Design a protein around this ligand. Structure first.
Ligand SMILES: O=C(O)CCC(=O)C(=O)O
Ligand SMILES: O=C(O)CCC(=O)C(=O)O
Ligand SMILES: [Co+2]
Length: 348
């Protein structure tokens, strides 16, 4: 048919009281023999203090987090509690609007033609592609000139100004993180800032509805982010996010009022694998929905994507192929709905 080109909004399937997840969402036995259960984090959760980041000991904790896990929880980040709560509250108010009004922001233009920006789910490439048990509102926040406000929700009316304020506050955290990472790597901070100059940045509001069979679906499939890194905010996280380290899966819980920073595939290539981009996924539960916001920061199209020359001395040579931004972006976009990691094809 053509029906597989336009997937359903899963929040409405859950509201309908659908007895079992439709076959379009059910994972194959090979991909869920895991029981979708993960172990607990053996070491205590990597947590970095931003207010003490200039200190030598916090920079050491940051190094151990990026080399061993590729992510960490950020505390004392300065973002006010009221602001973080209001971004998630207004997001919940949008997902709770009547379906007819939400469909005016659909990423299926006129209900047929797919684009990334908008409300819906990710691209369905083939008819037998397994769908995730979630919806997402995907919006470009940078550069501010390229914002397409027709896809920003108008109700609640505070959505546009509160997201614009949260975006500017996390871009400030973003700059504080690359500075500390540049110290760890021994490079000039201007190496990353030149590639982040007027680079695309996106806000992904995720809604994971409750699922009648949590052991049969993924809230979001296993994936590594393709950005430089991501700033993740979760509303009263009871569980769901699972991060993979050397093949094993571990439950990680973004505690309230803290932010989770995880590296993307772009950073792993630029840093020649000194740090690793963590693969992660979200499992559902039969009881309660889950809402998260991910701020994704990629690099601009100026310079190609390859190991930084300042890191390629005689001792540690290039571990990845240098590649153009275009084909790098095309590889991340195409392999997201597939099993094979795109970044593994760039390794030498
Ligand atoms: O396919 C997309 O646009 C988003 C997928 C994703 O989570 C990522 O590549 O970081
Ligand atoms: O909702 C989460 O905790 C995962 C966010 C995520 O992986 C993404 O949107 O790229
Ligand atoms: Co992700």
């Amino acid at each position: 048919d053509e029906s597989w080109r336009t997937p359903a909004i899963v929040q409405e399937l859950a509201a309908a009281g659908v007895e079992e997840p439709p076959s379009r969402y059910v994972l194959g036995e090979k991909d869920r023999s895991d029981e979708l259960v993960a172990a607990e984090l053996p070491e205590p959760i990597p947590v970095v203090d931003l207010s003490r980041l200039a200190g030598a000991d916090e920079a050491a904790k940051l190094r151990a987090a990026l080399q061993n896990w590729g992510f960490f929880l950020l505390t004392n980040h300065g973002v006010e509690t009221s602001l973080m709560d209001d971004v998630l509250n207004l997001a919940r108010e949008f997902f709770n609007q009547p379906i007819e009004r939400k469909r005016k922001f659909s990423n299926l233009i006129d209900g047929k033609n797919f684009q990334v920006e908008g409300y819906g789910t990710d691209r369905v490439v083939t008819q037998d592609q397994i769908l995730d048990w979630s919806d997402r509102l995907f919006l470009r926040v940078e550069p501010k000139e390229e914002r397409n406000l027709a896809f920003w929700p108008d109700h609640p009316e505070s959505f546009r100004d509160v997201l614009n304020e949260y975006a500017s506050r996390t871009k400030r955290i973003r700059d504080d993180i690359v500075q500390a990472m540049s110290k760890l790597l021994g490079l000039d901070e201007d190496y990353f800032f030149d590639r982040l100059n007027k680079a695309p940045a996106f806000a992904r509001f995720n809604y994971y509805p409750p699922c009648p069979r949590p052991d049969l679906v993924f809230g979001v499939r296993p994936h590594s982010d393709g950005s430089l890194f991501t700033i993740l905010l979760v509303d009263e996280d009871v569980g769901g996010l699972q991060i993979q380290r050397d093949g094993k899966w571990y439950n990680v819980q973004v505690t309230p009022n803290t932010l989770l920073i995880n590296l993307g595939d772009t950073m792993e290539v630029l840093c020649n694998g000194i740090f690793r981009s963590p693969v992660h996924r979200v499992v559902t539960n039969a009881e309660r929905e889950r809402i998260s916001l991910a701020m994704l920061y990629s690099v601009n199209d100026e310079k190609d994507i390859g190991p930084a020359a300042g890191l390629l001395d005689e001792n540690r040579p290039a571990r990845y192929r240098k590649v153009s931004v275009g084909e790098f972006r095309a590889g991340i976009f195409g392999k997201f709905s597939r099993r094979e990691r795109y970044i593994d094809s760039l390794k030498i």
